[PDB]
Amino acid sequence: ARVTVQDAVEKIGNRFDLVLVAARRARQMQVGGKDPLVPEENDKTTVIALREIEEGLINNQILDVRERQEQQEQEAAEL
Amino acid sequence: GGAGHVPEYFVGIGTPISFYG
């Protein structure tokens, strides 16, 4: 488990928006639309999302760019 | 005396006041 979230508060300032971005990521994960970016050591979506945040590879802007790319991918699905 | 859960009625005047267990 994750004993301290201090590092996730370090990489994303405003230790609240960490909760919001990590909830968005854990919703992307639990609802099986996406998959983890870090190895899952039998952790639930919560700690997996937090570990993604700690390594500095997931925050608001990265997830938003991914969503804005999926929007245009579905627009290309118009065929 | 200390560890405030009941007060200390018995003291010289001026002491803050216990607040004794």
Binding site: R2, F16, A22, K44, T46, V47, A49 | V6, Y9, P16
Partner: protein
């Protein structure tokens, strides 16, 4: 979904719009077939079906028939749930007044028509008629006439003169008047004649009618023509066990209303005399008023039940109404509770959870996981599996519990640490295992206390629990930076017994390679735990770039400290473990560990600390015996000398020499002295009792006695308790409070007799009662404090205000009681920073003064620091992140969005428990340090002897040392002797000056916060200048002010029969003491200003709290004060539309007249107003919070007559409506919506 909520008066058309049918009978059910009788209080035609999708007759019975109206029973077929939504109405024969607008303290109907309440009530009772629309007659359109006047009145004019009696008359009065007409005239009236009464009735009535007309609600709607009824399922008649039925008393009240209205209609159709129909109109009014709000009338008795009946307002208001008991607080699913146990083996971030509780709790997740893994065919099969409790489901519970935190809470929730998140650890049994270090945060003893657990369901809740409410994330208290995870009793003892030195033990003075050798030595029994030794140890220091360096050395220590060094993380110095490790220092160890290495190590450090403390406290074998208590043999000698003195004073008092009271006081003094003597004797006998021999004859050390260790270590006890286990035990008082004439001469080590125990029983009862009732009073104070200031959040980071407050080391006229570093740390500067001679700018205007800058200011030593405060914030409807500061459990600055007012209220509330409802019983300046005399605000004159004597009352004395700081401040009275003056140097302890000198503990805070004035207040003059006296002796002898460059039209009327203090021929500043006694904070603000009154309040409450030794930062009281002054009264309207005496909140007039000031038009002047917490709580725009708190009836009536619309900003009302909080996570979301 939806936005802002509106409230207004109900048009009868609107009442019928909510209503689908009119109830015309008092019947409820058929009494054999419990089907509803149409059409009554319970009716299927008006309201709906009893059973889902079924007609009452059953002709259109099938479920496909959706929306069809039956024609044999007139029933619409839908779910029975709509039997809880749909409304009905009743058409009243005679008009009826709404008791809420009649009996509201500012009677809405009465104040509306400029009419007293007694006359309106006398009219409603048919005691006297009243005129309406007289045209051109002798009387005005409103007047009162008795029946013998109404007799020969109509004989004068049969027409053009309408005069009715009762509620119809009030309705005709409300309908006849159109308020534009009666407003245009009030304009001129309030313009011409001054007459304070005139402006008061003006402001109130004119504001009433203008805000009235703005909305659109008509006055006639204060009189009820149609009456809406509550849906039946909200006041059900559901059958109970044994054939008996249960119903709300609402049904009885509606029944009486229907019965009496129908009887009135029948009497109208029967041509009844006027006496009977008037009696019936009065009775119908009584019934309607009893329905709306029972209590302002005869308080209708129940049926066969002696208690009154619950009305609608009784359903709404009160601590048990739907506001306090349902909307603010509610029962929750997925929750449990149990007794708690210890579970020391736990790491900090977890708790022991019983198996059965976790099974019953996580049932839905268990079902979902079981059917997801295919172990269960369907959900029914999963429930069957868990009801069988098959062995496979325990591993599934392991899976669902691993990363799913739970929330733990204790019953007396005071601060936010009253709830904390832990990781579940499955435990056999039925008790919850709570980590011991958190008990201090919970105030949770193991004396039977029970705790509750809750399960965060949604992903957002789990992440909020792991990131915010986690036990590891919350170590520093919010009220003060002090840690809340401090070891409590057993671990403190263990570490104290470990780290300690005796004069001799096994292997004293030998040498070891390091701590591992110390462990090998101790565990094998060759070396003792405590022994003066030198050992090579490796300490670590981050140095010179942040790069970690390490140095080893040979340190003088003991074996215990060497062994303990293995636990200490890398960065700390060995000096921290070389002392005796009292609790006070065992806290500072963890504090420095967090400040240096961070949270991640500090957590495991605390875990290992608790582990080793429990382990070595067990190994120590500490105990307590009957012989562990010292009894000095000098005790009886002191007792004997004391009683010889008492027989001496009895000799002297018997032969009429010493007076009664003087002799009594002298006995009291000598008994107190004897108590102190016995205490010091036993303490010197016990403290260094240990006489021991080491390579020599004798030496003495700090004692190894068990109870003395328990006392000194801070683990359990203090000096007083040890004194009372051993020596004579003080002196108590009688119920009057008069102290006893014979103190107890026994200790619990000895055996008390009857008298001593009987006298101690008094104080025991007094103190226990104080606790039991003061706790409830303190909770009440906490509630008031949250309600006054909770809607405050971090709306925006900055506002740009340069205003701030000056900070200096606090001195009350003695020595410094709190350093400037405690008052300025963690706050943003408010100005440039210079040395006394403007050498250069050390710190800028916006650097957060964290530890580095605090130390840097300590080097320069300038002690007048202007710092930013919450009250001076320019932000509108919120607080800027810079003016608040940085304080939090975390060390960084406050985040953009955290709700700070609630935290402030909780921080003030937690020390409320430690306070006391009732108190226990109760020549010149002597400088302490060495410094220089500095006389400030003093007139001086050289007398005959040459000693400087003081001729001013406001004289202050400062001690300026060689650096330039001020550590000693005193107040010197008028007529003092100064062998020195301003400019010379004095020694330490040297007497600088001489002169002749000639009841509630906790509510001392509540009276202060409520802005309540003292019982006998002092007075403060209005403006600077010379003062004098004037006109003689009629209740008041006048005080004439005198200014310098102008005349004073001001002249105060001070009663001469109270002694004055102002000098009749001396100058006095605005706010100078014209007499004595405590002062009222509102006037303090009105004269001195804002910063003065907030400084007064924060300093006074800081004194009251500091006396009990509770650390609280000034920020919380700062924000409370900012919310207290929120209202202000306009003075000049200028180019604005404000009223000359209107009270509006500061921020609103601020932004409005500031935009008008940016415009060319002249602004409006105002005067800051001080409202008490229980009064400033009402000055809240969104009334829903005001009705959650303070009395709901009048709040709703006021906001309804105003047509007040509510956009539900702030928190409490969002909590009512049940959506996201605009403070925490939701703020982001809310920031997305409020901007949208």
């Amino acid at each position: 979904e939806f936005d802002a909520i509106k409230i207004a008066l109900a048009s009868p058309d609107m009442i019928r719009s909510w209503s689908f049918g009119e109830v015309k009978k008092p019947e409820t059910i058929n009494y054999r077939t419990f089907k509803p009788e149409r059409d009554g209080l319970f009716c299927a035609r008006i309201f709906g079906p009893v059973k889902d999708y079924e007609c009452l007759c059953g002709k259109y019975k099938r479920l496909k028939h959706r929306g069809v109206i039956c024609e044999k029973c007139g029933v619409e077929v839908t779910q029975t749930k709509v039997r809880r939504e749909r409304m009905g109405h009743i058409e009243l024969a005679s008009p009826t007044a709404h008791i809420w607008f009649l009996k509201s303290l500012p009677s809405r109907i009465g104040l509306l028509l400029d009419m007293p309440l007694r006359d309106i009530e006398r009219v409603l009772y048919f005691e006297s008629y009243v005129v309406i629309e007289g045209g051109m007659t002798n009387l005005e359109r409103q007047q009162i006439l008795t029946e013998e006047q109404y007799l020969d009145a109509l004989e004068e004019f049969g027409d053009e003169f309408d005069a009715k009696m009762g509620a119809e008359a009030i309705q005709a009065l409300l309908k006849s008047m159109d308020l534009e007409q009666e407003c245009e005239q009030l304009r001129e009236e309030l313009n011409e004649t001054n007459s304070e009464t005139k402006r008061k009735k003006l402001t109130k009535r004119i504001k009433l009618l203008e805000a009235f007309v703005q909305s659109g609600n008509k006055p006639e709607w204060m009189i009820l023509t149609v009456l809406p009824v509550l849906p039946p399922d909200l006041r059900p008649l559901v059958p109970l066990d044994g054939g008996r039925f249960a119903t709300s008393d609402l049904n009885d009240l509606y029944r009486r209303v229907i019965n009496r209205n129908n009887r009135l209609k029948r009497l109208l159709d029967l041509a009844a005399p006027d006496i009977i129909v008037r009696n019936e109109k009065r009775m119908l009014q009584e019934a309607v008023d009893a329905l709306l709000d029972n209590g302002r009338r005869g308080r209708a008795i129940t049926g066969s039940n002696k208690r009154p009946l619950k009305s609608l307002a009784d359903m709404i208001k009160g601590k048990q109404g739907r506001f306090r008991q349902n909307l603010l607080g509610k029962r929750v699913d997925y929750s449990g509770r149990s007794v708690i146990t210890v579970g020391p083996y736990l790491r900090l971030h977890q708790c022991g959870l019983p198996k059965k509780m976790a099974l019953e709790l996580f049932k839905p997740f268990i079902y979902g996981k079981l059917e997801l893994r295919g172990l269960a065919t369907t959900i029914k099969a999963a429930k069957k599996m868990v009801e069988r409790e098959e062995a496979v489901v325990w591993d599934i519970l392991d899976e669902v519990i691993r990363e799913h935190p739970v929330l733990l809470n204790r019953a007396p929730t005071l601060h936010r640490l009253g709830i904390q998140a832990f990781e579940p650890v499955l435990i056999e049994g039925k008790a919850i295992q709570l980590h011991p270090l958190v008990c201090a945060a919970y105030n949770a003893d193991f004396d039977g206390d029970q705790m509750a657990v809750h399960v965060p369901l949604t992903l957002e809740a789990q992440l909020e629990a792991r990131a915010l409410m986690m036990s590891t994330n919350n170590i520093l208290s919010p009220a003060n930076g002090e840690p809340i995870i401090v070891p409590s009793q057993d671990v403190v003892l263990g570490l104290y017994y470990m780290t300690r030195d005796c004069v001799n033990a096994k292997g004293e003075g030998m040498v070891l390679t390091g701590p591992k050798e110390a462990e090998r030595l101790y565990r094998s029994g060759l070396a003792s735990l405590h022994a003066r030794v030198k050992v090579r140890i490796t300490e670590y220091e981050k140095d010179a770039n942040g790069e970690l360096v390490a140095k080893t050395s040979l340190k003088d220590t003991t074996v215990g400290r060497a062994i303990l060094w293995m636990i200490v993380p890398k960065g700390l110095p060995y000096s921290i473990v070389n002392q005796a490790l009292g609790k006070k220092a065992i806290s500072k160890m963890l504090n420095t560990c967090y400040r240096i290495l961070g949270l991640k190590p500090t957590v495991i450090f605390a875990d290992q600390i608790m582990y080793t403390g429990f382990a070595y406290a067990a190994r120590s074998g500490a105990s307590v015996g009957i012989d562990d208590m010292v009894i000095p043999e000098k005790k009886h000698e002191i007792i004997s000398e004391a009683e010889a003195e008492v027989a001496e004073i009895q000799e002297q008092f018997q032969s009429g020499l010493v007076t009664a009271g003087e002799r009594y006081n002298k006995v009291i003094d000598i008994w107190a002295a004897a108590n102190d003597r016995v205490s010091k004797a036993m303490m010197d006998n016990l403290q260094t009792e240990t006489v021991i021999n080491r390579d020599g004859q004798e030496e003495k050390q700090v004692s190894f006695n068990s109870i003395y260790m328990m006392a000194d270590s801070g683990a359990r006890g203090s000096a007083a308790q040890i004194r009372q286990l051993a020596g004579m035990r003080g002196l108590m008082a009688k119920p009057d409070g008069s102290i006893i004439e014979t103190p107890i001469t026994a200790n619990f080590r000895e055996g008390l007799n009857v008298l001593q125990y009987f006298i101690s029983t008094h104080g025991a009862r007094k103190g226990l009662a104080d606790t039991a009732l003061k706790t409830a009073n303190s909770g009440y104070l906490t509630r008031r404090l949250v309600d006054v200031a909770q809607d405050l959040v971090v709306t925006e980071d900055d506002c740009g205000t340069h205003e701030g407050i000056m900070m200096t080391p606090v001195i009350e006229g003695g020595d410094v009681k709190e350093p400037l570093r405690d008052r300025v740390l963690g706050r943003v500067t408010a100005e440039d920073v210079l040395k006394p001679g403007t050498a250069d700018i050390l710190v800028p205007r916006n650097t957060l003064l964290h530890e580095q800058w605090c130390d840097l200011l300590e080097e320069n030593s300038v002690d007048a620091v202007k710092v930013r405060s919450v009250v001076s914030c320019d932000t509108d409807f919120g607080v800027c992140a810079h003016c608040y500061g940085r304080d939090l459990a975390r060390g960084h600055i406050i985040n953009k969005g955290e709700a700070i007012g609630v935290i402030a209220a909780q921080s003030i509330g937690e020390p409320g428990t430690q306070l006391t409802m009732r108190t226990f019983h109760i020549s010149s300046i002597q400088v302490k340090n060495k410094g220089s005399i500095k006389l400030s605000n003093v007139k001086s004159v050289v007398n005959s002897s040459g000693k400087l004597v003081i001729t001013s009352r406001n004289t202050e004395l400062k001690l300026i040392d060689e650096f330039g700081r001020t550590k000693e401040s005193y107040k010197v009275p008028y007529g003092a002797v100064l062998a020195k003056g301003d400019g010379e140097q004095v020694a330490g302890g040297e007497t600088v000056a001489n002169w002749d000198p000639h009841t509630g503990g906790l509510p001392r805070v509540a009276d202060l916060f409520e802005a309540r004035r003292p019982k006998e207040p002092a007075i403060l003059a209005e403006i600077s200048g010379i003062v004098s006296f004037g006109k003689e002796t009629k209740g008041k002898r006048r005080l004439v002010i005198t200014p310098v460059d102008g005349s004073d039209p001001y002249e105060e009327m001070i009663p001469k029969w109270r002694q004055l203090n102002v000098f009749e021929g001396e100058r006095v500043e605005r706010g100078d003491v014209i007499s004595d006694g405590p002062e009222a904070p509102h006037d303090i603000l009105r004269l001195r200003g804002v910063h003065a009154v907030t400084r007064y309040i924060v300093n006074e409450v800081q004194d009251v709290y500091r006396l009990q030794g509770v650390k609280i930062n000034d920020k919380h009281i700062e924000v409370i004060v900012r919310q207290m002054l929120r209202k202000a009264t306009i003075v000049n309207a200028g180019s604005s539309d404000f009223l000359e005496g209107e009270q509006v909140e500061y921020s609103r007039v601020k932004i409005a007249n500031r935009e008008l000031e940016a415009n060319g038009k002249v602004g409006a002047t105002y005067s800051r107003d001080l409202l008490g917490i229980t009064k400033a709580s009402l000055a809240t725009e969104s009334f829903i919070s005001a009705a959650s708190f303070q009395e709901t009836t009048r709040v709703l009536t006021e906001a309804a007559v105003a047509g007040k619309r509510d956009e539900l900003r702030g928190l409490k009302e969002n909590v009512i409506v049940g959506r996201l909080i605009p403070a925490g996570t939701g703020y982001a979301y809310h920031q997305d919506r409020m901007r949208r």
